[PDB]
Amino acid sequence: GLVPRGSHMMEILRGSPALSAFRINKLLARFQAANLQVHNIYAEYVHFADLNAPLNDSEQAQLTRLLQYGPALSSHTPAGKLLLVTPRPGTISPWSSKATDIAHNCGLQQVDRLERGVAYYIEASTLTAEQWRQVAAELHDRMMETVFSSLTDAEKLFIHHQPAPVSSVDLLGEGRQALIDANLRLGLALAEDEIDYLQEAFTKLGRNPNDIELYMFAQANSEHCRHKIFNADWIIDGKPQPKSLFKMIKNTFETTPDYVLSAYKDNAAVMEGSAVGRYFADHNTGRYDFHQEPAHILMKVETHNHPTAISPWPGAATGSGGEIRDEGATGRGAKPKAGLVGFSVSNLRIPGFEQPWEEDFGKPERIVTALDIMTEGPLGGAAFNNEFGRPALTGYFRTYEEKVNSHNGEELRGYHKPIMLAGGIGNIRADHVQKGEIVVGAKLIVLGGPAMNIGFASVQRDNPEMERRCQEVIDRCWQLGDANPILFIHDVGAGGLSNAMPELVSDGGRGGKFELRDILSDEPGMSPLEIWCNESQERYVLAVAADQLPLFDELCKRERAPYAVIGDATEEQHLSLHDNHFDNQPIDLPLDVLLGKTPKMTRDVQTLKAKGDALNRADITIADAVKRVLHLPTVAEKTFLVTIGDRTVTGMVARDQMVGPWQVPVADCAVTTASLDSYYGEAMSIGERAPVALLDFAASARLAVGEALTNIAATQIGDIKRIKLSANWMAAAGHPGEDAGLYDAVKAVGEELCPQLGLTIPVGKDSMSMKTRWQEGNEQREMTSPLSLVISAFARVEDVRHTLTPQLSTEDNALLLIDLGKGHNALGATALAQVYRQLGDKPADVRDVAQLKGFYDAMQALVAARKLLAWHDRSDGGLLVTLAEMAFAGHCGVQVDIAALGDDHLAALFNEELGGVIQVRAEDRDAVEALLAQYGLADCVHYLGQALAGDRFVITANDQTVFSESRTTLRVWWAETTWQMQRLRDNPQCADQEHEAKANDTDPGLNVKLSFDINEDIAAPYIATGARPKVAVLREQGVNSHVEMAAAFHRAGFDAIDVHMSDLLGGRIGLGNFHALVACGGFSYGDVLGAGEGWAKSILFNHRVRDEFETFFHRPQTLALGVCNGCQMMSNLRELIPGSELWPRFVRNHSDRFEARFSLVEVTQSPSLLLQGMVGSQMPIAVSHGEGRVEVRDDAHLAALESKGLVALRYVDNFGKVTETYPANPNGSPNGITAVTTENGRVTIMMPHPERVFRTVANSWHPENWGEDSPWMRIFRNARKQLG
Ligand SMILES: Nc1ncnc2c1ncn2[C@@H]1O[C@H](COP(=O)(O)OP(=O)(O)O)[C@@H](O)[C@H]1O
Ligand SMILES: [Mg+2]
């Protein structure tokens, strides 16, 4: 369909069926639950193309082809009422941005913009007027989409509005009233003293302020941006305090400056790392090489609490996105490496899985439920991390909502406004740590996507692939070393350009003159205020010397990263924004005026302290307590938050959340290698204990620090001063007792605990409005969060290989408890108390600073000495949970006696005091106990018993059995929360299969069977000649797994060349010079239009490049490998590859969820030259994909493929049989197929990532006897030997 559309033409192309059977059934079932009699429903994707010029027959065919993607679902003829769901008018979906890029890269410049909607066909002849509105409501997100009655109504999405002019606020003509009116109208939230400041400022300038100027000032002076609370003077209980909160945090750096390279001077802190081989492609040669040099470590943690309460998916996604920009914009450019995620919400109240302690207290109509946040939120956060390409290796998840007698008496305390935390680490070059000076005349650039009106105002938008393109530019820049063109760089976040640019020039001691019309925009109707202040994502601002512009342009064009020079740095510290369209100046202000601060804040507050009531144990029994606690989400298995996120990208992940053969999510901390050629690395851990703040503020803070330390303790670090902390403070400022509580908590860690331990807090953030208000009936209600300190610990690691996990060994052993609680056994504010709807009397706390320090030092000694078999610290759920989780990870039993822990067994088992359980060889018990005593821990150390083969979890006290149960029974209970979450979020069949598998104790876990010598380097004789064949390491925009792929071929003797698709189109690289080629993994074009489709079609539609690939494949001796995204791409290039007529397609996983797993596969017999000598081998491999399901045309196609013998890899369960059961087979591929080859065996494509696990240290779990090389290194060596 082609119809007139403004100055353009809009083409409407019907797509493929949009909903799988279980999704359709889920909708129908939801209609009956609302009494809406719907007989049937059918959905179909519909595409809209805004054309600025005609498409000839060939181009039209290409467009239609581009829009043919997705699973081959059941098609039906439209019947019933049409309800078209599309993005809301005035908004452009990320799908649109990415789909339009593909169209352009396929030579279809006539396509102005591509957009997509979903056409629903509902058969229901009974519904009234309101019922139809209820049906429509169930088919769309009210915050992001709209429902239309005709496909033609999609024309509204492409309306071109004329540029709105700037508006002045008539201060000179109406007086102060004009500022008061503007304050209310524009929602400036200006204080009286700020209005006074602006009044004098403009009266002095003798002109009316423009709306844009007032808006810029208001955002810059918001609590979020200025951090007034953290810089305020204090008066506590009638006594003026010497330091501000920020000053007390800075005290930790003053006491411990050790290893710190940068703190409180950038968007992230930097600490010393290790000298290792930084691997990247040279600018002049394009060849990947190791560069021995210090890879310093950067760290940052941020939050996106408010946005997430309104729109969870975008809120969490941009939470990660904004934090990733902070990392890349550190110093003069840096590279993100790994991330962490945190979530705090109210009770889940899962339908049909209600827990005893949960009560519905209602909530504001304007926000989403805790369950909605934990459903869409994690997916959004993982969506950004997966698409951008950074592993998410650690995090926390707490649920809390209860009517408690706290500091301000009986009140509702919880997280209606959630904590959505995102952070991570990165690496940076020594000479790029410090920001450079900005020379006068420097070009001020905006790197990133075009602006839109996003700064409904709380609904964000994420395009991870755009940020990936930007990161590639930043990488090319720091990779130029001393030639790095970046003089200064900063991320664009709150306030948008209105905050970012003034801040950039100000930090350089310069001013700046900008041109409004030079900024890239996706919506012409935006006013100067909107263009300058919108909070559009994936944008960076930087300064570049004028003579370096041509080089910068070259770098951006090659990566397809949009950029625009929008201004120039000036000597005069003045801010000027000109508008060439309206011929005026929206902004004309001296920086000292715009950035001028109103009088410092002074908070005169008083201490409120809850009394705390003894725990009522009337309804409590140890057995029932165990069952309830394992059912608290905070304690329960976190699989639904772990497998949805990539944990292997970069190939530098040594320790992820999933532990052992049984892949149980219980790792206490994350560990990454510093490079692909070293055992040095980085570790991340989190400590948090918010509920404790409802009884004791300082205790909660001290415990957060303490837990971060106990979680990271079993990693080889050494000096405690190596551990650096990020302190993120969440609180309901102004709420009774919270202010004084915050000061006391900050003082407890900044002035006392951390300085005594030798811990620096060089970074941090604060969120001061953690409370929600609404009217339930006729009365007002409020939900206030406890003071919530989240401590994230980061540290350089001495040896990644020596990290211990909770996986118990069944060899002769001794289990020893290190009770830092010193027998206090506090039960206040514990999982046990919460589970029984109580708060308790007294909570845990750091009982002895010296012993905590001694504990860390003792653990470091034991780790370095290799005297530990396992370690698991105590936190939520207490000793009971610690022992249970170790039993789960080791898939064994436990026999322990707690008689020495006190007569109160409930308190002994459930207290959440600091400490944990170490497992040591029986023959080492005496020596270990002696070592602990040397650190003064003698009275805190207790021998509990031993881990034993079997399924019995037994706790005794002398001759009395305290608690006894099947370990498997506990394991399954502990898994029920993630089961229920997966069942409602994903394909229920898959969720059930994964859960049921856990109940089978006979599962042997991942295990290996090799058909060859893993240590035999069959490529060695070839490498020894010095002759190194080149391999084209192919990448398209969005590809993110190229570095490790290059490193794998390098290890095998190849000269890895970075070949971007732009290089092929530009003629800079020709495939005729290569004998080997590899298509890498990632999210090319964000997988829009089908994973690997845009990449493949951009090749097919550009006849010159299509011919280049076809010629390559048709040569007699060439070899090609396609992995993950590359496998999908090559499968869409069948027409160019000989012997590939039987290849299947790769579509959406049966689970309908991204699967990041460590799966067991078996190498099958095929012509594959890359798998030579490996047939019959069975070993685990990294799986990380959302569209890896093998899909054939029909069974004739499957039978043909199989009979031809082209299947090279198959998923097998732990018992060793080919399987289609989930998650053994993570995607649902028929006959477990996950790799196929051509008839001649010269081309092989596979979904798993061999290159992410070619190093043994990068294998989540692996046999203890393996050396540096894993089985997967053989693929690359086979390639080298084959080329000869
Ligand atoms: N939101 C989350 N995202 C990703 N991983 C998470 C999240 N919450 C917890 N995890 C991971 O799940 C495992 C168990 O979490 P948790 O029980 O909170 O750990 P601990 O008690 O050791 O602090 C850890 O490996 C942790 O990193
Ligand atoms: Mg835990």
Ligand SMILES: [Mg+2]
């Ligand atoms: Mg722990």
Ligand SMILES: [Mg+2]
């Ligand atoms: Mg924890």
